[PDB]
UniProtKB/Swiss-Prot annotation, chains B, D:
Keywords noted in UniProt: Periplasm, Signal, Transport
GO biological process: Gram-negative-bacterium-type cell outer membrane assembly; lipopolysaccharide transport
Outcome recorded upon mutating residue 9 to D/E: No change in activity
Phenotype caused by lack of the gene: Results in an earlier growth arrest and onset of cell lethality.
Up-regulation conditions: Transcriptionally regulated by sigma-E factor.
Protein name in UniProt: Lipopolysaccharide export system protein LptA
Presence of keyword Signal: yes
Full protein stretch here: 28 to 164 of 185
Gene Ontology molecular-function annotations: glycolipid transfer activity; identical protein binding; lipopolysaccharide binding
Primary location: periplasm
Swiss-Prot/TrEMBL domain comment: The N-terminal domain interacts with LptC, at the inner membrane, and the C-terminal domain interacts with LptD, at the outer membrane.
Length: 141, 135, 141, 135
């Protein structure tokens, strides 16, 4: 992750916005674009919660994720849902999830991504499988 | 074949963890690794790309299997509890009930060492003994 | 030689085994025991070659040779090296060689033994000699 | 001595061939046969044990020598080009420049026959003649 993204303001943009004062849930619908530094999430619906520290959930067909790494190369991925826990800098993709790095990619039903640890995990549902491919250092863009 | 090292690694598993700092990938649950003409089956696989040419594959299975086509069109196949493949040094090590064959040739032992380019196999025994029958 | 030994599988046993696919040389090291019927060779190292029909070379301190004869009596001998050519059933002992039959023995630097001919020859190096003793038919075991 | 026939045969040679089917041994190169109190030197020796009591020793030498102790403590010694000893019939035959002596007694001829138990020697001549001098 471009180190320092986390310390940036979270800019959201959408058509509609709903704000629920009791409960404290903010919703955005439309061409929802959420940006934080180089981080970019696109979804149809984005709901941000502050349980108790912010959490951001994105829903799309699919919801996309982008972020530049310290080396100038991007990380990209999509899934039915992007769960981003701001505090842990932890991104979870579920539902036909896909995540891509310059030297490797992963396809699965759930992909977790600890950004400030540079560690990714992927999981499959009963009857299904994870696909990982390591890109040879010469087929990399 | 010699050009397998430059081929992409395709892995299927029930789950995986990828440490991209320390360039290590761990796969578990009916893992199938294929890289060029290399196929590996195991319960757990660990692949390490220090820096791909210095790549290392470790496989753990009840039989855990290894397969690779050779340049002279003869495939190498074998199985063991643990399987270790150093692609840098074209070197395979099979441990625990190891078996390895290349068509008409074969060997068995508690540990098999297999130099892929030198085309030379070696079998070793624990507290036991290696044993063959030639006609 | 117990007639029919030659038609038996050659069983080898050792600690390590090396197999050299280019060249076609199989090596065995350790408490190498090679058996074929009643034939038994013990060595530290055994290398089997198929020039072109198998050949088996045994090295020990010394490498030993045993085989029961059709009459129930054994032939035994030892030397630094046991060269056994399977095709000709021809055993050569070299290096402080010794060969023993129920009624006779031979000590020399090289002893050849055509098993399927029941003929033995022994040789000495310049400056050395062969010793043959014929055992009286009453001092025989 | 009479019990020599039951004694082991010790032979030294540069080389030997032993046919164990047809019970024949051939020795070449400075051969030394010793059996009890029997010593034989020759370039080539052939010993045959049909079945040892029917043993036969043939010796070939430039002098080729024979030696055997007798029961009465007097040794028999002689030499010839060819030497033939039938231990079954206590019989020695020396051919070609034969010489044989037993202490004070002796004989010379182209062929000497020597009955060991009868203590009786005989000398024969080719196209020539036997010859002695008595004082």
């Amino acid at each position: 992750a471009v180190t320092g993204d986390t310390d940036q303001p979270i800019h959201i943009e959408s058509d509609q916005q709903s704000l629920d004062m009791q409960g404290n849930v903010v919703t955005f619908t439309g061409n929802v674009i959420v940006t934080q530094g180089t981080i970019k999430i696109n979804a149809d619906k984005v709901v941000v919660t502050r349980p108790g520290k912010e959490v951001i959930d994105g829903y799309g067909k699919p919801a996309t994720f982008y972020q530049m790494q310290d080396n100038g190369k991007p990380v990209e991925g999509h899934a039915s849902q992007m769960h981003y826990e701001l505090a842990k800098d932890f991104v979870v993709l579920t539902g036909n999830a896909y995540l891509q790095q310059v030297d490797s990619n992963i396809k699965g039903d759930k992909i977790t991504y600890l950004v400030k640890e540079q560690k990714m995990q992927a999981f499959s549902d009963k009857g299904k499988r994870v696909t990982t491919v390591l890109v040879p250092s010469q087929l990399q863009d």
